[PDB]
Amino acid sequence: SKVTAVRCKKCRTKLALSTSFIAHDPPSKESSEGHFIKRAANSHRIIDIQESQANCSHFFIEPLKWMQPELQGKQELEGKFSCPGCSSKVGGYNWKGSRCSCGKWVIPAIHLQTSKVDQFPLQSTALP
RNA sequence: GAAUGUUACCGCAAUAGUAAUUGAACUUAGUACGAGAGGAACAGUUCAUUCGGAUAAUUGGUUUUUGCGGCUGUCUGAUCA
Ligand SMILES: [Zn+2]
Ligand SMILES: [Zn+2]
Numbered sequence: 399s400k401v402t403a404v405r406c407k408k409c410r411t412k413l414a415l416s417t418s419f420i421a422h423d424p425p426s427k428e429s430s431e432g433h434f435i436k437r438a439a440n441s442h443r444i445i446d447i448q449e450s451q452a453n454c455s456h457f458f459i460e461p462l463k464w465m466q467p468e469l470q471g472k473q474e475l476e477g478k479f480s481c482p483g484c485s486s487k488v489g490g491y492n493w494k495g496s497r498c499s500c501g502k503w504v505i506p507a508i509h510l511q512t513s514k515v516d517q518f519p520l521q522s523t524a525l526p
Numbered sequence: 527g528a529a530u531g532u533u534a535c536c537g538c539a540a541u542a543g544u545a546a547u548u549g550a551a552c553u554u555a556g557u558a559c560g561a562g563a564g565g566a567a568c569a570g571u572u573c574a575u576u577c578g579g580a581u582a583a584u585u586g587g588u589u590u591u592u593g594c595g596g597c598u599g600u601c602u603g604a605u606c607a
Binding site (some may be wrong): 496498503 | 601
């Protein structure tokens with residue numbers, strides 16, 4: 399396949415490129431990975447039995463040269479980020495959670511939404 | 527409405543009643559929250575629902591202004607009236 403590029407919606411600015419987006423094997427589904435576990439106040443009690451969704455509603459990327467000044471200035475645990483040419487939020491940063499939309503705990507990495515975010519091929523269109 | 531000197535004007539306020547009501551839209555903001563889907567609020571600005579008090583510039587209704595005009599039948603000889 400050919401290379402792609404992911405950009406923002408309501409604003410025309412290029413956010414990131416291809417050679418990213420690890421698939422990371424979304425389903426396992428034994429008893430607890432496909433279930434959105436909400437532990438209660440005591441006794442490791444699990445009330446909410448929510449099946450995980452089928453679609454992958456997040457993009458998983460690498461740290462970026464546009465992400466370097468935000469990571470360098472006033473570093474905290476979890477926050478939010480946006481576009482420099484706009485003010486529409488694209489997600490947040492974390493190194494201890496913010497699992498997926500499918501919901502597995504992964505290595506510390508930056509996520510990207512696909513709500514108010516779209517993707518386009520870097521080459522020309524197919525011209526139907 | 528009698529009576530309080532007569533009459534006239536301007537007032538006080540004891541007591542009694544009392545009335546306003548609810549919903550939207552924009553902005554706040556697709557922001558907060560939320561992994562995402564979704565998804566607010568205070569303040570501000572417009573209008574609306576039910577109720578109430580008044581008013582008649584305009585619009586509508588009403589017409590014994592019998593005000594002006596028209597029409598039928600008949601009577602005043604015709605015309606006019
Ligand atoms: Zn933007
Ligand atoms: Zn996934």
